[PDB]
Design an enzyme around this catalytic site. Structure first.
Site, PDB file in Angstrom:
ATOM      1  N   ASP A 130      36.539  -1.298  39.744  1.00  0.00           N
ATOM      2  CA  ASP A 130      37.882  -1.615  39.255  1.00  0.00           C
ATOM      3  C   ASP A 130      37.913  -2.119  37.795  1.00  0.00           C
ATOM      4  OD1 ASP A 130      40.795  -3.519  40.547  1.00  0.00           O
ATOM      5  OD2 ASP A 130      40.680  -1.627  39.454  1.00  0.00           O
ATOM      6  N   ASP A 157      37.179  -2.058  52.043  1.00  0.00           N
ATOM      7  CA  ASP A 157      37.866  -1.338  53.123  1.00  0.00           C
ATOM      8  C   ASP A 157      39.276  -1.857  53.381  1.00  0.00           C
ATOM      9  OD1 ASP A 157      35.588   0.216  53.304  1.00  0.00           O
ATOM     10  OD2 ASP A 157      34.946  -0.631  55.265  1.00  0.00           O
TER      11      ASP A 157
HETATM   12  N1  LIG Z   1      39.691 -16.343  36.421  1.00  0.00           N
HETATM   13  C1  LIG Z   1      40.823 -16.146  35.770  1.00  0.00           C
HETATM   14  N2  LIG Z   1      41.121 -16.882  34.714  1.00  0.00           N
HETATM   15  C2  LIG Z   1      42.238 -16.694  34.049  1.00  0.00           C
HETATM   16  N3  LIG Z   1      43.139 -15.791  34.373  1.00  0.00           N
HETATM   17  C3  LIG Z   1      42.987 -14.975  35.420  1.00  0.00           C
HETATM   18  C4  LIG Z   1      41.781 -15.113  36.197  1.00  0.00           C
HETATM   19  N4  LIG Z   1      41.855 -14.208  37.152  1.00  0.00           N
HETATM   20  C5  LIG Z   1      42.995 -13.551  37.006  1.00  0.00           C
HETATM   21  N5  LIG Z   1      43.672 -13.998  35.979  1.00  0.00           N
HETATM   22  C6  LIG Z   1      44.975 -13.470  35.568  1.00  0.00           C
HETATM   23  O1  LIG Z   1      45.688 -13.134  36.726  1.00  0.00           O
HETATM   24  C7  LIG Z   1      46.225 -11.836  36.633  1.00  0.00           C
HETATM   25  C8  LIG Z   1      46.370 -11.199  37.996  1.00  0.00           C
HETATM   26  O2  LIG Z   1      45.139 -10.932  38.614  1.00  0.00           O
HETATM   27  P1  LIG Z   1      44.970  -9.839  39.705  1.00  0.00           P
HETATM   28  O3  LIG Z   1      43.555  -9.467  39.750  1.00  0.00           O
HETATM   29  O4  LIG Z   1      45.578 -10.306  40.915  1.00  0.00           O
HETATM   30  O5  LIG Z   1      45.821  -8.642  39.184  1.00  0.00           O
HETATM   31  P2  LIG Z   1      45.412  -7.567  38.151  1.00  0.00           P
HETATM   32  O6  LIG Z   1      43.947  -7.596  38.155  1.00  0.00           O
HETATM   33  O7  LIG Z   1      46.173  -7.736  36.948  1.00  0.00           O
HETATM   34  O8  LIG Z   1      45.993  -6.229  38.683  1.00  0.00           O
HETATM   35  P3  LIG Z   1      45.866  -5.471  40.070  1.00  0.00           P
HETATM   36  O9  LIG Z   1      46.071  -6.376  41.199  1.00  0.00           O
HETATM   37  O10 LIG Z   1      46.953  -4.510  39.877  1.00  0.00           O
HETATM   38  O11 LIG Z   1      44.512  -4.897  40.054  1.00  0.00           O
HETATM   39  C9  LIG Z   1      45.285 -11.103  35.737  1.00  0.00           C
HETATM   40  O12 LIG Z   1      45.984 -10.204  34.914  1.00  0.00           O
HETATM   41  C10 LIG Z   1      44.780 -12.180  34.838  1.00  0.00           C
HETATM   42  O13 LIG Z   1      45.642 -12.166  33.732  1.00  0.00           O
HETATM   43  O1  LIG Z   2      40.264  -9.534  43.806  1.00  0.00           O
HETATM   44  C1  LIG Z   2      39.807  -8.448  43.869  1.00  0.00           C
HETATM   45  N1  LIG Z   2      40.447  -7.436  43.371  1.00  0.00           N
HETATM   46  O2  LIG Z   2      41.608  -7.661  42.737  1.00  0.00           O
HETATM   47  C2  LIG Z   2      42.820  -7.005  43.084  1.00  0.00           C
HETATM   48  C3  LIG Z   2      43.948  -8.007  43.013  1.00  0.00           C
HETATM   49  O3  LIG Z   2      43.797  -8.975  44.035  1.00  0.00           O
HETATM   50  C4  LIG Z   2      38.541  -8.235  44.593  1.00  0.00           C
HETATM   51  C5  LIG Z   2      38.434  -7.076  45.297  1.00  0.00           C
HETATM   52  C6  LIG Z   2      37.304  -6.818  46.010  1.00  0.00           C
HETATM   53  C7  LIG Z   2      37.166  -5.555  46.795  1.00  0.00           C
HETATM   54  O4  LIG Z   2      37.704  -4.472  46.108  1.00  0.00           O
HETATM   55  C8  LIG Z   2      36.742  -4.051  45.189  1.00  0.00           C
HETATM   56  C9  LIG Z   2      37.398  -3.063  44.272  1.00  0.00           C
HETATM   57  O5  LIG Z   2      37.727  -1.934  45.044  1.00  0.00           O
HETATM   58  C10 LIG Z   2      36.301  -7.717  46.027  1.00  0.00           C
HETATM   59  F1  LIG Z   2      35.238  -7.417  46.728  1.00  0.00           F
HETATM   60  C11 LIG Z   2      36.405  -8.886  45.333  1.00  0.00           C
HETATM   61  F2  LIG Z   2      35.405  -9.729  45.380  1.00  0.00           F
HETATM   62  C12 LIG Z   2      37.527  -9.154  44.592  1.00  0.00           C
HETATM   63  N2  LIG Z   2      37.708 -10.281  43.887  1.00  0.00           N
HETATM   64  C13 LIG Z   2      36.858 -10.904  43.052  1.00  0.00           C
HETATM   65  C14 LIG Z   2      35.582 -10.467  42.805  1.00  0.00           C
HETATM   66  C15 LIG Z   2      34.757 -11.143  41.948  1.00  0.00           C
HETATM   67  C16 LIG Z   2      35.173 -12.291  41.283  1.00  0.00           C
HETATM   68  I1  LIG Z   2      33.895 -13.317  39.980  1.00  0.00           I
HETATM   69  C17 LIG Z   2      36.470 -12.717  41.547  1.00  0.00           C
HETATM   70  C18 LIG Z   2      37.288 -12.033  42.416  1.00  0.00           C
HETATM   71  F3  LIG Z   2      38.513 -12.447  42.642  1.00  0.00           F
END
Ligand SMILES: Nc1ncnc2c1ncn2[C@@H]1O[C@H](COP(=O)(O)OP(=O)(O)OP(=O)(O)O)[C@@H](O)[C@H]1O
Ligand SMILES: O=C(NOCCO)c1cc(COCCO)c(F)c(F)c1Nc1ccc(I)cc1F
Ligand SMILES: Nc1ncnc2c1ncn2[C@@H]1O[C@H](COP(=O)(O)OP(=O)(O)OP(=O)(O)O)[C@@H](O)[C@H]1O
Ligand SMILES: O=C(NOCCO)c1cc(COCCO)c(F)c(F)c1Nc1ccc(I)cc1F
Ligand SMILES: [Mg+2]
Ligand SMILES: [Mg+2]
Lengths: 288, 288
Positions: A130, A157
């Protein structure tokens, strides 16, 4: 120590996407500021426990190019992932403020992505799955790090289920994809950040002069059946152009891998360059 | 009276999808049980106010084939839509419990969908935009009703942004779609419910004997470039088969409209039939 729901206090909302919200929180026992991601899944208790169990390998993912992990737990209808708070946010937010990211800065971004991906593959035998600007986080110390990778097979999954895609042509068309898919995503992400908009459908002549929405079948048909996007010539070095060209080769076996990209001229050049990423970041987003 | 956040008490979670959670709630001033849908949008205050304003037309959407509306408001980061609680849930949940929905029951479903769509078009000049089994709700009184339609132009815009699609070929390919798009969605939804699985890619010979996951470019390419799905012959009447055939014609101008479907033999037949939908519902999902 163990993280639980009790021990957290919400400061603000950092953002949300598809299936997750992330809060800026205070972990009260430690005083530490964290980002707490909440994933809501309607799933049986045994699957939920496998997910939590599989996220514990994040304790073992330690890299200057990977977002720090503090812990993962389940509480009322929600899986929590607690991570290092990145005070620069993600590269999609920085791009909105910047308009467009300098090629020199994208040289440092590229290095950090390649190094993070390499670390995940070499040390954890996994692909990211991703890669895109919102999954690349930055901070005021000048750090660039990956989050949101596929550490948990069961979470992969359970999550399965856009007006834009970073997915490779092979991944769009079937199950026959792997680590090479991540290279395509990286390449496309770099073109977006260089140029200042999602690069598909290509900028026409007029758009290029002026800086220098598609139906979703239309967009995915483009990705699979049309030639890959390309940096403008003139405004970017031939090294950068060739770098993104090698990322965006449609056949994933002739597409460059991480090993090749690590010794690509552009990386050598960026590796050498003195860049104040931290100062650039803060100026453009207004930190100091 | 006016609805506000204060006045609500949560009973349970009815479900969630992409961009929304819905709770079973008690509105304390009135004692009324409602379904409260929360949509989280990161949008400016002026847009949010237009959305709320545009949802007030739901007060005017009164139909036995449309989910009752109580009110819509904004509170901390969330737009609330408060609606009639449908104690049978949606047709996707009932399908999971039923395995497969009898053709006679689908005759009543079809009538209610066509009538709801007609009401929206005739009285409100709008298309639904999101017909699929989860947006058709049922209750223990035997009522079948539509929710989640495009009442608000701004909410449509703000929401814009799958392993399965109910979107017509024309809508998949561009902006050139309208009320006819809803007919395709209805047709596809009926085939899914009749047959007991999402009907694309078609069931092979072996699957049909045995009852009687696709990449997303693969799936959408199928919808646009391959012939539409079809009911099995033998197990379903020729009237039903012809009905879904007329819904699933790829060209939207030769596809039947609501006017034609309303006088289609199948509807005439179902219109005539004595069906205890309420008793069927409760038995299959375990209400009484
Ligand atoms: N560890 C972090 N520190 C600071 N900001 C964060 C962190 N993790 C996420 N964010 C902010 O939160 C937002 C949303 O995160 P999230 O992963 O849920 O969505 P996304 O990655 O933008 O998109 P999608 O869910 O469509 O993949 C991110 O765009 C980022 O800007
Ligand atoms: O959050 C995740 N995806 O974001 C989509 C918005 O919720 C996420 C997804 C998966 C599974 O999907 C893999 C992509 O197909 C996973 F195993 C994770 F551990 C995730 N999170 C994650 C991983 C490493 C760190 I450091 C911090 C995290 F938050
Ligand atoms: N008024 C209601 N009464 C009873 N149950 C409801 C009501 N509204 C929604 N639900 C339940 O809540 C679930 C989630 O609703 P929501 O509209 O958010 O998602 P969805 O329609 O299933 O899918 P998506 O968001 O992917 O379109 C629905 O499947 C339905 O089962
Ligand atoms: O909720 C909605 N969609 O669901 C997606 C999971 O959140 C929804 C969406 C839109 C805009 O999008 C139109 C389709 O493209 C809208 F205008 C609504 F009024 C909606 N809700 C809604 C409408 C009528 C009733 I009665 C009850 C409701 F909750
Ligand atoms: Mg993310
Ligand atoms: Mg819905």
């Amino acid at each position: 120590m163990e993280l639980k729901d009790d021990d957290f206090e919400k400061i603000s909302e950092l953002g949300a996407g598809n299936g997750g919200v992330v809060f800026k929180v205070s972990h009260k026992p430690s005083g530490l500021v964290m980002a707490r991601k909440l994933i809501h899944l309607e799933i049986k208790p045994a699957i939920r426990n496998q997910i939590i169990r599989e996220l514990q390998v994040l304790h073992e993912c330690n890299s200057p190019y990977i977002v720090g992990f503090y812990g993962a737990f389940y509480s009322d209808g929600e899986i929590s992932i607690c991570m290092e708070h990145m005070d620069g946010g993600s590269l999609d937010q920085v791009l909105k403020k910047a308009g467009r990211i300098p090629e020199q800065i994208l040289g440092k971004v590229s290095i950090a992505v390649i190094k993070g991906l390499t670390y995940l593959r070499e040390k954890h035998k996994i692909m990211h799955r991703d890669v895109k600007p919102s999954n690349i986080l930055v901070n005021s110390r000048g750090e660039i790090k990956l989050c949101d990778f596929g550490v948990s097979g069961q979470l992969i999954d359970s999550m399965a289920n856009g007006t834009r895609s970073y997915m490779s042509p092979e991944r769009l068309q079937g199950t026959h994809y792997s680590v090479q898919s991540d290279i395509w995503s990286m390449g496309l992400s770099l073109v977006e950040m260089a140029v200042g908009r999602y690069p598909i459908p290509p900028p026409d002549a007029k758009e290029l002069e002026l800086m220098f929405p598609m139906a979703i079948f239309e967009l995915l048909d483009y990705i699979v059946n049309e030639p890959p996007p390309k940096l403008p010539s003139g405004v970017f070095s031939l090294e950068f152009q060739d770098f993104v060209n090698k990322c965006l080769i449609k056949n994933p076996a002739e597409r460059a891998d991480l090993k090749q990209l690590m010794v690509h001229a552009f990386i050598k050049r960026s590796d050498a360059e003195e860049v104040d990423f931290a100062g650039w970041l803060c100026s453009t987003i207004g930190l100091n």
